[PDB]
Design a protein around this ligand. Structure first.
Ligand SMILES: *[C@@H]1O[C@H](CO)[C@@H](O[C@@H]2O[C@H](CO)[C@@H](O[C@@H]3O[C@H](CO[C@H]4O[C@H](CO)[C@@H](O)[C@H](O)[C@@H]4O)[C@@H](O)[C@H](O[C@H]4O[C@H](CO)[C@@H](O)[C@H](O)[C@@H]4O)[C@@H]3O)[C@H](O)[C@H]2NC(C)=O)[C@H](O)[C@H]1NC(C)=O
Ligand SMILES: *[C@@H]1O[C@H](CO)[C@@H](O[C@@H]2O[C@H](CO)[C@@H](O[C@@H]3O[C@H](CO[C@H]4O[C@H](CO)[C@@H](O)[C@H](O)[C@@H]4O)[C@@H](O)[C@H](O[C@H]4O[C@H](CO)[C@@H](O)[C@H](O)[C@@H]4O)[C@@H]3O)[C@H](O)[C@H]2NC(C)=O)[C@H](O)[C@H]1NC(C)=O
Ligand SMILES: *[C@@H]1O[C@H](CO)[C@@H](O[C@@H]2O[C@H](CO)[C@@H](O[C@@H]3O[C@H](CO[C@H]4O[C@H](CO)[C@@H](O)[C@H](O)[C@@H]4O)[C@@H](O)[C@H](O[C@H]4O[C@H](CO)[C@@H](O)[C@H](O)[C@@H]4O)[C@@H]3O)[C@H](O)[C@H]2NC(C)=O)[C@H](O)[C@H]1NC(C)=O
Ligand SMILES: *[C@@H]1O[C@H](CO)[C@@H](O[C@@H]2O[C@H](CO)[C@@H](O[C@@H]3O[C@H](CO[C@H]4O[C@H](CO)[C@@H](O)[C@H](O)[C@@H]4O)[C@@H](O)[C@H](O)[C@@H]3O)[C@H](O)[C@H]2NC(C)=O)[C@H](O)[C@H]1NC(C)=O
Ligand SMILES: *[C@@H]1O[C@H](CO)[C@@H](O[C@@H]2O[C@H](CO)[C@@H](O[C@@H]3O[C@H](CO)[C@@H](O)[C@H](O)[C@H]3NC(C)=O)[C@H](O)[C@H]2NC(C)=O)[C@H](O)[C@H]1NC(C)=O
Ligand SMILES: *[C@@H]1O[C@H](CO)[C@@H](O[C@@H]2O[C@H](CO)[C@@H](O[C@@H]3O[C@H](CO)[C@@H](O)[C@H](O)[C@@H]3O)[C@H](O)[C@H]2NC(C)=O)[C@H](O)[C@H]1NC(C)=O
Ligand SMILES: *[C@@H]1O[C@H](CO)[C@@H](O[C@@H]2O[C@H](CO)[C@@H](O[C@@H]3O[C@H](CO)[C@@H](O)[C@H](O)[C@@H]3O)[C@H](O)[C@H]2NC(C)=O)[C@H](O)[C@H]1NC(C)=O
Ligand SMILES: *[C@@H]1O[C@H](CO)[C@@H](O[C@@H]2O[C@H](CO)[C@@H](O[C@@H]3O[C@H](CO)[C@@H](O)[C@H](O)[C@@H]3O)[C@H](O)[C@H]2NC(C)=O)[C@H](O)[C@H]1NC(C)=O
Ligand SMILES: *[C@@H]1O[C@H](CO)[C@@H](O[C@@H]2O[C@H](CO)[C@@H](O[C@@H]3O[C@H](CO)[C@@H](O)[C@H](O)[C@@H]3O)[C@H](O)[C@H]2NC(C)=O)[C@H](O)[C@H]1NC(C)=O
Ligand SMILES: *[C@@H]1O[C@H](CO)[C@@H](O[C@@H]2O[C@H](CO)[C@@H](O[C@@H]3O[C@H](CO)[C@@H](O)[C@H](O)[C@@H]3O)[C@H](O)[C@H]2NC(C)=O)[C@H](O)[C@H]1NC(C)=O
Ligand SMILES: *[C@@H]1O[C@H](CO)[C@@H](O[C@@H]2O[C@H](CO)[C@@H](O[C@@H]3O[C@H](CO)[C@@H](O)[C@H](O)[C@@H]3O)[C@H](O)[C@H]2NC(C)=O)[C@H](O)[C@H]1NC(C)=O
Ligand SMILES: *[C@@H]1O[C@H](CO)[C@@H](O[C@@H]2O[C@H](CO)[C@@H](O)[C@H](O)[C@H]2NC(C)=O)[C@H](O)[C@H]1NC(C)=O
Ligand SMILES: *[C@@H]1O[C@H](CO)[C@@H](O[C@@H]2O[C@H](CO)[C@@H](O)[C@H](O)[C@H]2NC(C)=O)[C@H](O)[C@H]1NC(C)=O
Ligand SMILES: *[C@@H]1O[C@H](CO)[C@@H](O[C@@H]2O[C@H](CO)[C@@H](O)[C@H](O)[C@H]2NC(C)=O)[C@H](O)[C@H]1NC(C)=O
Ligand SMILES: *[C@@H]1O[C@H](CO)[C@@H](O)[C@H](O)[C@H]1NC(C)=O
Ligand SMILES: *[C@@H]1O[C@H](CO)[C@@H](O)[C@H](O)[C@H]1NC(C)=O
Ligand SMILES: *[C@@H]1O[C@H](CO)[C@@H](O)[C@H](O)[C@H]1NC(C)=O
Lengths: 461, 122, 122, 122, 49, 48
C-alpha cells in the first residue's frame, strides 16, 4: 500500500545560527590596503546577488533576538582591535605636563592648551623638552594640586592609549554579510514593516546589501532610507527604557566643519616611534560646528510627530534636550575625516507637536539654518571601554563633511505629570542599535534538504 | 534556488535538483572564511552519508520498501501532494524520525545480505 | 599519474582511473598544510557533486541522452578519438559549458521523475 | 557501534552498517576541534574514494570478478566465516594489499570500457 | 594541554617587571610565636605619572 | 631596576655612529637607534 519514500533537495528550512563572512563590492583596493575595516580581505562580489522572490510564503520575524547584530558588533570590535594593534603606544608620554595657555584670549572656545613636557629621545639617557597643543577635554589637573599648572592626560589612571597609525583611514566602506553554502538569508519586503511580526512578502538571498558601518550616537547618518513612510520601531513602546529607532523617508542634509587652519608636528618618542600632535594654529580661530536646514528639520520632526501620535493617541508629544550625563553620553558623537566631533543638540530637539498640523511653512521656502556647536576630542574611550582607547592623530587643514540623516534614536521620559505633553529625549550609546537599523530585514536559515513522504509505490526488488 | 518554496509537493518534483546544485558552491575574515568553508563540506557530507546508509544515494527520488504507519497517516495522496507545501509537511511530520531512519537502514542492509545470498546461491 | 597526457582519446580510456586515485591522497607550515588539506577536499567534492547532479556518478564513463549540437560539432569520430588528444579538446570545446551542464541536469531530473511515475503507475 | 567485534564474520554481515553510521559526525580547544573536524572528513572521504575507484561504492557488500590466489588461501569457507573473527582476519591477511587494490581498479575500468563498447556497438 | 592552557590564562594579566626593585625589609612578626614568615618590605613604586 | 652597572664590549666599526651634536667627542650610539629597535638572534638558532 503506502510505502515511505525520501526526497533529496526539498525546499524547506529551519532557524539556525552560523558564522557569516564579509564580502566587499569589488572596489579598487590597489592602493587603499590600509582601511580600518580590512575590506580588501573580503571576498569580491563580482556577480549580482540571487534576488529571488518566493511567493505564497509567510515567515515570522523578530529582530531584537537577532544574532546577526551581535556577530556584527563582535566583528567591529575585533576589527578595531586588530587594526589598532601594531601601531604606536603612548606609554612614555604619560608624564607631568606644564600647560600655560595657547589661545590668545577666550576667542570662540579656548579649548587649546600649550602643554610642554620632557620627552625621551632615541638615546635612553638624554631627555628633551618638547611642546604640543592639546585639547581641553584631554588634560586633567594633576592630583594634589594647589591650583597649579600641572596637568596629566585623561587616560593615565585608567589605561594606556595606542595612537592610530596615520595611514589608517576610517572611511565606512560598505560590507556585505554572506551565509555559508547550505544556508540562506531570507528578507522581508513589506514597505511598512513593523520590525517584528510576520511578513507576507519574503525573498531569498545569499549576501546582504552593502551596509555602512557608520558609528554615531543620537542621529543616524548615511543609512538606508525607508520606502514610503516613516517607520517607528521599538521593543514595546510602553517600557520607557527601550530605544525608539525612527526611520525617515526623506534624508536631511547636515554639513559639519572645523574651520581653523590646524597644523601637525611629529615628536620622536623612543627608537623608531613618532607622536603626531597639534603644532600651531595658522590664522584666526573660529568655531567648529554643524549646519542643518531649519525648515526641513521642522518638517521632519512634524512628520515624525504625525507618525508617532497614532501610537500614543489623543496626546501631545514634546521634544526636549538629552538627559543628564557626560559629554560623550549627551552630545551627538560624530566622525568625519578622522576628527571626532561631539555636537551639542539642545536647540535641535526643541519644540512640540500636538494633533493640529501647526506649521504650513513647507508651502513657503526659507534659507534659515540651525547651527549647532561641536567640541573636538583626541583621546576616545568608545564602546564603553570594552575596546582599547585610541589617540586620534590630528589632521592638517580644515575639515568638511556632507552627510545625510536617515534615522533617529529617541527615548521616552513619561510620568504622571505627562498626562498631555509627552517627553521624547535623544539617547544613544548602545552601538548595536546602529546596526539593528540596517539588519532589520534579514534573517538566517539552514536548509534541510531531506524529506519523508509516502507515494504508494514500492521499491523494485 | 528555493524557487518552489511555496508551491505544491508535485511542483517540487522538477525543481529538487536546483536545491542540490547550490549546496557546495559559493585574519578575522580569514577565520570566518575558513569556518564557512569547513561548514559547507560538513553539511553536504552529512546528507550524502545518510543517503548512502539508506542505500538510495545517487538518485533524488527513492522507494524504501517500508510501510507507512497509520499513526503517521492523516490525509489522502491528492490532499498531501496537491494542496500542502513541503514546509508545512516538514512542520507536521517531523516527529518519529530516527526510528524511520533506522528502519530504512536495517531494510537496506537486509536487502544487501539477501541479494548477496541470492548471488552466492546461484 | 597523467601518463597518457600526450596519447590519443581512446588511449586515455584505459588510464582514466589512475588520475582519479591520486586526487585525494598525497605554525607557518602548519597553516599552509591545513589550507592544502582543505583545498584537496573541496576540489574533490566539487567534481563528485557535479557528477552526482548529472546522475552518472559512481562510474567513469557516462551516456547522457542529450543530442550533440551541430554548432559544437566540427570533426568525425575517427578524427576526434584517434588524432586529437584531450588538451586540444579542452582548449576548443570549453564554450557552452554551463548550458551543456544545465541540459544534463534537467535531463537527469526528467529521467528520475519519469521512472518514478512509471513505477508508481505499476 | 562495534558490537560485533568478537562475533563471527557472518554474524557481522547484518550489523556492518552501524559502523558506517557513526563514521562521520559522531583557542586551544578551538584548534583541537578544528583539527578533529577536518580529520573526520578526510578519513571518511578516503574510504569512499577507494570504494568508488573499485566501482562497487553505494553498497556495503561487493563482488569484484577477480580470482582469489592460492598464495593467500589457507582455510575453508566454513573455517573462515564460522570460526575466525574479522580482527584476526585483518591481522593475518593484511599483506599483498596494494596488488589486490590495483587489480580491482583495473578490473573496474575494464568493465566500464567493455560496457561502453557494448552499448556503442548496439 | 595543561601547559598551554596555563600559558594562555597567564598571558593577558599584569606583569611584575616594575616590582623588581630594591626592597627595604624589616620584620613585622617580630614575636617568637614559631610562625614568623611575614617580612614587612617597602620600596619605591612607580605611579601612573 | 635601581642599580646600574658600568660594562664594556668591543663593537665593530660599522655598527657605531658618532652621536648627534658632537664636537668630535667620543660619544657613540648604535646605528639602529634612530630607525627601529633591534632584536638579537637566539644563540641556539642555526642559519644553515
Ligand atoms: C607654546 O609653548 C612653546 C614652549 O612652551 C612655545 O615654543 C617656544 O616659543 C618661543 C617664543 O617664540 C621660542 O623662542 C624663540 O625661538 C626662536 C628660534 O628658536 C631657536 O633659538 C632659541 C634661542 O632664542 C633656542 O632656545 C631654540 O632652541 C632654537 O634653537 C628664536 O629665534 C627666538 O629668539 C628671539 O627672541 C629672543 C627673546 O625671546 C631674543 O633674545 C633673540 O635675540 C631673538 O630675537 C626665541 O628665542 C622657542 O624656540 C619655542 N620652542 C621651545 C621648545 O621653547 C610656543 O611658542 C608656545 N605657543 C604656541 C602657540 O605654540
Ligand atoms: C557620510 O557619507 C559622506 C559621503 O561619502 C561622507 O563624506 C565624505 O567624507 C570623507 C572623509 O570621511 C571625504 O573623503 C576625503 O575627501 C577629501 C576631499 O576630496 C575631494 O577633493 C579632492 C581634491 O580636490 C578630490 O580629488 C576628491 O575627488 C574630492 O573631490 C580628500 O582630500 C580626502 O583624501 C584622504 O584620503 C586620500 C586617500 O587615502 C589621501 O591621499 C589624502 O591625503 C587624505 O588622507 C578624503 O578622500 C569625502 O570627500 C566625503 N564625501 C563627500 C561627498 O563629502 C561622510 O563623511 C559620511 N559620514 C560619516 C559620519 O562618515
Ligand atoms: C610595615 O611597614 C610600613 C612602612 O614601612 C608601616 O606603615 C606605616 O606605619 C606607620 C606607623 O603606624 C604609619 O604612621 C602613622 O600614620 C598614621 C596615618 O598616616 C597618615 O599620617 C602620617 C603622619 O603621621 C603620614 O606620614 C601618612 O602618609 C598618612 O598621611 C598617623 O595618624 C600616625 O601619626 C600618629 O603617630 C605619630 C608618631 O608616629 C605622631 O607624631 C602623630 O601625632 C600621631 O599620633 C603615624 O604617623 C604610616 O602611615 C604607615 N605607612 C607608611 C606608608 O609609612 C606598617 O605599620 C608596618 N607594619 C605592618 C604590620 O604593616
Ligand atoms: C576649507 O575651506 C574652504 C573654504 O570654504 C573649502 O572650500 C569650499 O568647499 C566647498 C565644498 O563643499 C565648496 O562648495 C561648493 O561650491 C560649488 C559652487 O562653486 C562656485 O562657487 C564657489 C564659491 O566660493 C567658487 O569658488 C567656485 O569657483 C564656483 O564659482 C557648488 O556647486 C558645490 O555644490 C559646493 O557647494 C565651496 O565653494 C568652497 N569654497 C571656496 C572658497 O573654495 C574647503 O573645502 C575646505 N577644505 C576642506 C578639505 O574641506
Ligand atoms: C543623501 O541624499 C541625497 C539626496 O537627498 C542623495 O543624492 C542622490 O543620490 C542618488 C544615488 O546616488 C542619485 O541618483 C543617481 O543620479 C545619477 C545622476 O543623474 C544617475 O545617473 C543615477 O542613475 C541615479 N541613481 C539611480 C539609482 O537612479 C541622485 O541623483 C542624487 N541626488 C538627488 C537630488 O536625488 C545622496 O546620494 C545621499 N547620500 C549621500 C552620502 O550624500
Ligand atoms: C624637565 O627637565 C628639566 C631639566 O632640564 C627640569 O628642570 C629642572 O627642574 C627642577 C625642579 O624639578 C629645578 O630645580 C629647582 O631649582 C630651583 C633653583 O634654581 C629651586 O628653587 C627649586 O626648588 C627646584 O629645586 C631645576 O632648576 C630645573 N632645571 C635644571 C637645569 O635642572 C624640569 O623640571 C623637567 N620637567 C618639566 C615638566 O619641564
Ligand atoms: C581617573 O581620573 C579621572 C580624573 O580625575 C577621574 O574622573 C573623575 O571622576 C569623578 C567621579 O566620577 C568625577 O567627579 C564627579 O564630577 C561630576 C561633575 O562632572 C559631579 O557632578 C560628581 O558629583 C562627581 O564629583 C570627576 O569630575 C572626574 N574628573 C574629570 C576631569 O572629569 C576618574 O574617575 C579616574 N578613574 C579611576 C578609575 O580612578
Ligand atoms: C548644549 O547647549 C546648551 C545651550 O547652548 C547648553 O545649555 C546651557 O548651558 C549653560 C552653561 O554655560 C547654562 O548656564 C548656566 O546653567 C546653570 C545650571 O542651570 C546655572 O546655575 C547658571 O546660572 C547658568 O544659567 C544654561 O542654563 C544651559 N541652558 C540654556 C537653555 O541655555 C548645554 O550646556 C550644552 N551642552 C550640553 C552637553 O547639553
Ligand atoms: C518649528 O517647530 C516648532 C515645534 O515643532 C514650532 O514651534 C512651536 O509653536 C507653538 C505655537 O506656534 C508654540 O506653542 C506655544 O509657545 C509659547 C511660547 O512660550 C508657549 O508659551 C505656549 O504655551 C505654547 O506652548 C511652541 O512652544 C513652539 N515650540 C518651540 C518654539 O520650540 C514652530 O512653529 C516650527 N517652525 C516652523 C518654521 O515650522
Ligand atoms: C626611595 O626614594 C627616596 C627618595 O624619596 C630615597 O630616599 C633617599 O635615599 C638617599 C640614599 O639613596 C638618601 O641620601 C642619603 O643622605 C644621607 C644624609 O641625609 C647620607 O648620609 C647618605 O650617605 C645618603 O647620601 C636621601 O637622604 C633619601 N631621602 C631623600 C629625601 O632624598 C630612598 O633611598 C629610595 N629607596 C627606598 C628603598 O626607599
Ligand atoms: C639615522 O641616523 C643615521 C646616522 O646619523 C643616518 O645615516 C646617515 O644618512 C645620511 C643620509 O643618507 C648620510 O649622509 C650621506 O653620506 C654620504 C656618504 O656616505 C654622502 O655622500 C651624502 O652626500 C650624504 O651626506 C650619512 O652618511 C649617514 N650616516 C652614516 C654614519 O652613515 C640615517 O639617515 C638616520 N635615519 C633617519 C630616518 O633619521
Ligand atoms: C514582494 O517583494 C519583491 C521584492 O522586493 C517585489 O518585487 C519587486 O517589484 C518591483 C516593482 O515595483 C520591481 O521593480 C523589482 O525589480 C522587484 N524585485 C525583484 C528582485 O525583481 C514584489 O513586487 C513584492 N510584491 C508584493 C505583493 O509586495
Ligand atoms: C526639558 O527637561 C527639563 C528637565 O530638567 C525640564 O526642566 C524642568 O522643568 C520643570 C517644569 O516645571 C521644572 O519644575 C524643573 O525645575 C525643571 N528642571 C530644571 C533642572 O530646570 C524642561 O522644562 C524640559 N523642557 C520642556 C520644554 O518642557
Ligand atoms: C527652544 O526654542 C525657543 C524658540 O524657538 C527658544 O526660546 C527663545 O530663546 C532665546 C534664546 O535662548 C530667547 O532670546 C527668546 O526670548 C526665547 N523665546 C521664547 C518664546 O522663549 C528656547 O531657548 C529653545 N530652547 C533651548 C534649550 O535653547
Ligand atoms: C508594531 O510595533 C510595535 C513597537 O515595535 C509593537 O508594540 C507592536 O506589537 C507591533 N505590531 C505588530 C503587529 O507587529
Ligand atoms: C482622539 O482623537 C480622535 C481624532 O482627533 C477623535 O476622533 C477621538 O474621539 C479622540 N479620543 C477621545 C477619547 O476623545
Ligand atoms: C495645537 O496647537 C496649535 C498651536 O497654535 C493650536 O492652534 C491648535 O488649536 C492645537 N490643537 C489642539 C487640538 O489642541
Amino acid at each position: 500500500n503506502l510505502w515511505v519514500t525520501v526526497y533529496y533537495g526539498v525546499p524547506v528550512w529551519k532557524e539556525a545560527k552560523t558564522t557569516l563572512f564579509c564580502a566587499s563590492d569589488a572596489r579598487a583596493y590597489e592602493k587603499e590596503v590600509h582601511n580600518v575595516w580590512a575590506t580588501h580581505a573580503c571576498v569580491p562580489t563580482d556577480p549580482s546577488p540571487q534576488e529571488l522572490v518566493l511567493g505564497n510564503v509567510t515567515e515570522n520575524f523578530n529582530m531584537w533576538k537577532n544574532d546577526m547584530v551581535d556577530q556584527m558588533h563582535e566583528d567591529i570590535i575585533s576589527l578595531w582591535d586588530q587594526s589598532l594593534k601594531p601601531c604606536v603606544k603612548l606609554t612614555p608620554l604619560c608624564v607631568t605636563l606644564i600647560c600655560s595657555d595657547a589661545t590668545v584670549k577666550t576667542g570662540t572656545v579656548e579649548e587649546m592648551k600649550n602643554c610642554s613636557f620632557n620627552t625621551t629621545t632615541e638615546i635612553r639617557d638624554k631627555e628633551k623638552k618638547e611642546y604640543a597643543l592639546f585639547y581641553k577635554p584631554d588634560i586633567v589637573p594633576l592630583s594634589e594640586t594647589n591650583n597649579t599648572s600641572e596637568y596629566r592626560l585623561i587616560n593615565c589612571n585608567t589605561s594606556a592609549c595606542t595612537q592610530a597609525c596615520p595611514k589608517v583611514t576610517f572611511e565606512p566602506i560598505p560590507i556585505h554579510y554572506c551565509a555559508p553554502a547550505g544556508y540562506a538569508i531570507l528578507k522581508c519586503n513589506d514597505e511598512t514593516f513593523n520590525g517584528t511580526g510576520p511578513c507576507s512578502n519574503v525573498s531569498t538571498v545569499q549576501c546582504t546589501h552593502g551596509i555602512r558601518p557608520v558609528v554615531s550616537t543620537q542621529l543616524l547618518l548615511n543609512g538606508s532610507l525607508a520606502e514610503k513612510e516613516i517607520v517607528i520601531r521599538s521593543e514595546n513602546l510602553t517600557n520607557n527604557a527601550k530605544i525608539i529607532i525612527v526611520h525617515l523617508h526623506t534624508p536631511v542634509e547636515i554639513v559639519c566643519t572645523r574651520p581653523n587652519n590646524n597644523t601637525r608636528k611629529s615628536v620622536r618618542i623612543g627608537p623608531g616611534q613618532t607622536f603626531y600632535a597639534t603644532g600651531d594654529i595658522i590664522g584666526d580661530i573660529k568655531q567648529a560646528h554643524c549646519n542643518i536646514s531649519e525648515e526641513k528639520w521642522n518638517d521632519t520632526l512634524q512628520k515624525v510627530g504625525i507618525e508617532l501620535q497614532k501610537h500614543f493617541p489623543n496626546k501631545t508629544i514634546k521634544y526636549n534636550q538629552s538627559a543628564g550625563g557626560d559629554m560623550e553620553i549627551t552630545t551627538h558623537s560624530f566622525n568625519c575625516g578622522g576628527e571626532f566631533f561631539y555636537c551639542n543638540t539642545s536647540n535641535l530637539f526643541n519644540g512640540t507637536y500636538n494633533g493640529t498640523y501647526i506649521s504650513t511653512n513647507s508651502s513657503a521656502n526659507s534659507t534659515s539654518t540651525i547651527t549647532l556647536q561641536c567640541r573636538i576630542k583626541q583621546i576616545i574611550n568608545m564602546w564603553q571601554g570594552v575596546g582599547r582607547c585610541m589617540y586620534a592623530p590630528p589632521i592638517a587643514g580644515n575639515i568638511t563633511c556632507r552627510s545625510n540623516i536617515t534615522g533617529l534614536l529617541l527615548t521616552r521620559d513619561g510620568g504622571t505629570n505627562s498626562n498631555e505633553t509627552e517627553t521624547f529625549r535623544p539617547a544613544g550609546g548602545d552601538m548595536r542599535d546602529n546596526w539593528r537599523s540596517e539588519l532589520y530585514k534579514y534573517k538566517v536559515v539552514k536548509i534541510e534538504p531531506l524529506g519523508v513522504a509516502p507515494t504508494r509505490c514500492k521499491r523494485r526488488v | 534556488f528555493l524557487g518552489a518554496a511555496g508551491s505544491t509537493m508535485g511542483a517540487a518534483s522538477m525543481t529538487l535538483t536546483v536545491q542540490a546544485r547550490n549546496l557546495l558552491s559559493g585574519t578575522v575574515w580569514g577565520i570566518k572564511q575558513l569556518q564557512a568553508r569547513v561548514l559547507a563540506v560538513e553539511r553536504y557530507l552529512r546528507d550524502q552519508q545518510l543517503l548512502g546508509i539508506w542505500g538510495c544515494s545517487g538518485k533524488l527520488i527513492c522507494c524504501t520498501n517500508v510501510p507507512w504507519n497509520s499513526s503517521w497517516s492523516n490525509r489522502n495522496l491528492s490532499e498531501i501532494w496537491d494542496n500542502m507545501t513541503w514546509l508545512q509537511w516538514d512542520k507536521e511530520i517531523s516527529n518519529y524520525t530516527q526510528i524511520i531512519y533506522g528502519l530504512l537502514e536495517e531494510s537496506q542492509n537486509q536487502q544487501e545480505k539477501n541479494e548477496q545470498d541470492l548471488l552466492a546461491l546461484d
